[PDB]
Amino acid sequence: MIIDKLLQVSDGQAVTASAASTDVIDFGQANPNTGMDDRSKMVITVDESADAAGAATVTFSVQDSADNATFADVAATGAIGKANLAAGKQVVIPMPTKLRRYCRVYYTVATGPLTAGKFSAQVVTGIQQNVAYPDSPRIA
Amino acid sequence: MIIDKLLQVSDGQAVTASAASTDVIDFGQANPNTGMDDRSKMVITVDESADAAGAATVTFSVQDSADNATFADVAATGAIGKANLAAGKQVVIPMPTKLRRYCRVYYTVATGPLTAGKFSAQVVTGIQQNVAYPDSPRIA
Amino acid sequence: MIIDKLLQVSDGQAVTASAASTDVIDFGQANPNTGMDDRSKMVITVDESADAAGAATVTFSVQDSADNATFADVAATGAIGKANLAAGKQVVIPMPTKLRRYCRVYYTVATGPLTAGKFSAQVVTGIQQNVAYPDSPRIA
Amino acid sequence: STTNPTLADVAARMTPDGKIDPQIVEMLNETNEILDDMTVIEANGFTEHKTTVRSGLPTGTWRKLNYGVQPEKSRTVQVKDSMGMLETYAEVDKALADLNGNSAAWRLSEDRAFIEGMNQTQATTLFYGDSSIDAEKFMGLTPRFNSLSAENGQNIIDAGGTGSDNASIWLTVWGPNTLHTIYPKGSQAGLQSRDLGEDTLIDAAGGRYQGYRTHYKWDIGLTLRDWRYVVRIANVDVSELTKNASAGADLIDLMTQAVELIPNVGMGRPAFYMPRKIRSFLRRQITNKVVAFDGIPCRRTDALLLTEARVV
Amino acid sequence: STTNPTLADVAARMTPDGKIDPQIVEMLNETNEILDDMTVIEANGFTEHKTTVRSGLPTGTWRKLNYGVQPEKSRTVQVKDSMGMLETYAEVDKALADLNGNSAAWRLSEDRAFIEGMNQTQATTLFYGDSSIDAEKFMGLTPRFNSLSAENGQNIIDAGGTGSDNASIWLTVWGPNTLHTIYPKGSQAGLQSRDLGEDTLIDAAGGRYQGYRTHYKWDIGLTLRDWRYVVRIANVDVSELTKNASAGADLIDLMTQAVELIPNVGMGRPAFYMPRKIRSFLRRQITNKVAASTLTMEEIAGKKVVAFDGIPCRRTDALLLTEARVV
Amino acid sequence: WDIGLTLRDWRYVVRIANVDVSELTKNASAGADLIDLMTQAVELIPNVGMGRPAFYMPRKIRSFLRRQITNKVAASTLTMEEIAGKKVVAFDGIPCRRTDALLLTEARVV
């Protein structure tokens, strides 16, 4: 999965309380609207796991801003549960179709707080996703 | 914007309470997974306006299920405000990458209840999205 | 087993009282005598079962009329008992050799009323009946 | 009751005789002409037409004796545009169309008239087509130049409406690069009269009778490549116009400021589109001071609503 | 509520930056082969296939002296059995197929899945053909041998399993007078993909549509002239199979005894049909019995079963692996 | 060197996972037998038709595969001279390619 070093945000961030991403993507324009590339997409990959007192959920969400000051959601996932964040899980957010300058990633952690877990968020074009598909399924 | 007679859901539903959509799309497989298509995307159009007691927001969000019964959100927009929902405002949700059989569109309405406003949801390829961009802006 | 849908009467009729078939077959003549084609025959299949308070019997019988109004029996089966109407029991009535316009199928039900059981009547050429026959039977 | 058919009747079939059949003079039909003037290029995406639009420029540097300058980056957003299809069929009781041996001349007259009606629906949908209302049909000019807040708002000049009785004038430049229509890949550009076979038709009873049929696909969208070549002069309150360009809203200066507005009529071809009422008061206004208005042709268009709601 | 299905705007689902995906990886196609191996002869009756079969022998008598004995009469019943037609249309709105001109490419990619879907259904039904329930389908291999009480009940070999996780192997002889398929007057077998060309459709309202359409007739029946030529090896509990012919049910004796059940393999040609899961355990069990004997270093893999007993042993997927045990 | 890896359909790839390496013994006895775990792997592929199949094992496995093959044949026919056994080359025949760059103590996959 190819990665632009500049779109990389949250390299391996230990998201424990309901926090935002470390790094903020600054596109060089007021409205990149990079959903229209119909190719760019956010990914949050997981390591090592969503250990928490539990049961907790991590709702990943992309946020825009006019200027790098206040963020607001423009895309969201839903409450991805713990025990779906084993080492190795791409949680894909398609790029919001209407972006502004300065995108960041918020990790809305539903209670309680996570005890361990890193996440990698970055915009790629596009994901490595090869889900296993059925066989017959009569045999066998 | 070309449309599938069958991918039309919630034709012009006068969404007053925070309700789900009228129609539920049934794909014919366990995993349509049409986000991988890199082309399908939900669009919710607004008419005539999200008039309400206010200040209110409608969070449009798609939901999956194994069977046509219990849903869980797989993508969402965020609190799109009233008066950002005049007649003629497409809120595009790019199609979640990991779909199941039976997708529907939920209209999460924050208080108070909407008094007027239909929303039209359909899966298209692709959205008619042409926002105007600046010119110089020095001249003039 | 090939079936002519037009010669089909009682597509899957739920026989509870001693009632007649839903549809009445209309030939394009006064004396079709299609018993004479020496090939046609009524078949009544059973589903799901002769469930009844019991002990009940179901007499399948073909009826003619000159006009579609008053019928009279032209073939009959006999009192076929409940529990001889397992799911899948072809009761063949050979087509009577002197047919008139408008043939129908009546279900003479012995008391008590049948509580569950459909029957599908159709004129075919001809039934699938290939039951295994003994061989030795000393070995075996 | 009342007999209300869709198909051609022997009454209707008996009126393009005779014993001569063609040349039907169409009095009541709109005579709008964007349709003649518009350009077509096959759309590039799948039922959309991506268009990359320069978003931010590299600015240069003066570089001084012995001193390395730093590198620039050209930012880009792309903007895709949709189409919609308008198909209709045109069927006849076959014996009726075939009779007196005029099968083809009939098929043709119905053809010439289907074309005319499709011109009207498509040219009305081209100025006011919302993908937000019509849902199935493509979006064109409104509400692309709608709110004054919009970043192309400098391009819409308010004549000053207030009331609902107010027209708008358009100015476009049709060209490969700057506003053109698009048709899908690969159904052919423009109105297709494909004429199918005899095929059996059905009487309401079932008493079926054989007939002709013709399809009429025509699927266009409208790329608005850059709004900068298009100006809407919205809100021309028509209750107020007079030939003595004194009372109400003046057109001629209002219009030239619409011209003075677009860089740079180079290619392809500019045009004004205004309701016949408007072309009328405009010309009356011009003569009071005293095909082509001022370096661009002015195309009066009937299928352009006269009383549209005023913009804010 | 839930809206579908002729061919929803998921032609999108089959394309690249471009046209319809040619190299599509055909997943749900399985390589069952009776359909290749089966014999086809036109059925003889009007839409059935009559067959006269000897029902009773004259016995003769030991006759005491000076006593004129009874004449005998060789009683003989005949059986007719039917066909069924399996056919389908394949429609697409012409507007959906036309874009990017993948009209023909689409018709094609859709077609490959139709051929495969018909073989899939035909072979799944040749084994589980219930004409007693589905009425419309011709009757296949079950339950012609179902209850052990049935006159061909000796020919079904109980593998000795129990519970729902258990298959059966089939052993048949395809030939004119012992088992074959039958096709009609005068429709030919098998699968006919006629392309209907473009024609008009109807919107559910009445509101006009227009499209392509393709037909796929394939109408077969099935003579089982005599059940003596077919033996079924039922209740093969598959979870209990082990490669060491050890726990659960052995295949190799359970398979040869099926060979001894056929009265002389003379005509036409025999074939075992086993679920692939069985074929695998079969390969392993064979090499394991031969391992305590004489197998070379290099033939350690075991030649995949080809001729079990000089009977082709054919892999057939469209054959249920979790079958209800046959009481 | 920029490569990724298409697995068009997994039907053509089989994994023999959780093979406990301490418990492997040459007498195909304790632990997991390789010769069957390998033949069943061969039967799992829907007709190896195209292009070409290959086994990939850590050298540890290749050694125990070798020992076990000469051991299974030992109960049949192995010669004085082939006591050590021909080094594994083509199992099915399918080539058996040695891969060092293959982890030997990998966590169990369940």
Author numbering:
A (entry chain L), B (entry chain M), C (entry chain I): 1 to 140
D (entry chain G): 5 to 294, 310 to 331
E (entry chain F): 5 to 331
F (entry chain A): 222 to 331
Authors' text:
Bacteriophage BPP-1 is a short-tailed, dsDNA virus and a member of the Podoviridae family. It infects and kills Bordetella species that cause whooping cough in humans and respiratory diseases in other mammals. It has a T = 7l icosahedral capsid, ∼670 Å in diameter. In this study, we report the three-dimensional (3D) structure of the BPP-1 head at ∼3.5 Å resolution determined by single-particle cryoEM and derived an atomic model.
Arranged on a T = 7 icosahedral shell, MCP and CP each have seven copies or conformers in each asymmetric unit. MCP alone forms a complete icosahedral shell without any noticeable gaps. CP forms dimers bound to the underlying MCP shell at local and icosahedral twofold axes, making the maximum diameter of the BPP-1 (670 Å) bigger than that of the HK97 capsid (659 Å). CP contains two β-sheets each consisting of four anti-parallel strands, and a ∼36-Å long extension (Thr125 to Ala140) with the C-terminus exposed on the external surface. In BPP-1, CP subunits form a dimer through β-sheet augmentation between the F-strands of two CHEF sheets, forming an 8 stranded β-sheet visible on the external surface. Although little sequence identity (CLUSTALW score = 5) was detected between BPP-1 MCP and HK97 gp5 proteins with ClustalW, the overall architecture of the MCP resembles that of HK97 gp5, with an axial (A) domain, a peripheral (P) domain and an extended loop (E-loop). The orders of these three structural elements in BPP-1 and HK97 are N-β-α (‘BPP topology’), N-α-β (‘HK97 topology’), respectively. Moreover, the topology of the Johnson fold in BPP-1 MCP is non-circularly permuted as compared to the previously known topology of the Johnson fold. The P-domain and E-loop of MCP in neighboring capsomers join head to tail to form rings (bright colors), which concatenate to form non-covalent chainmail.
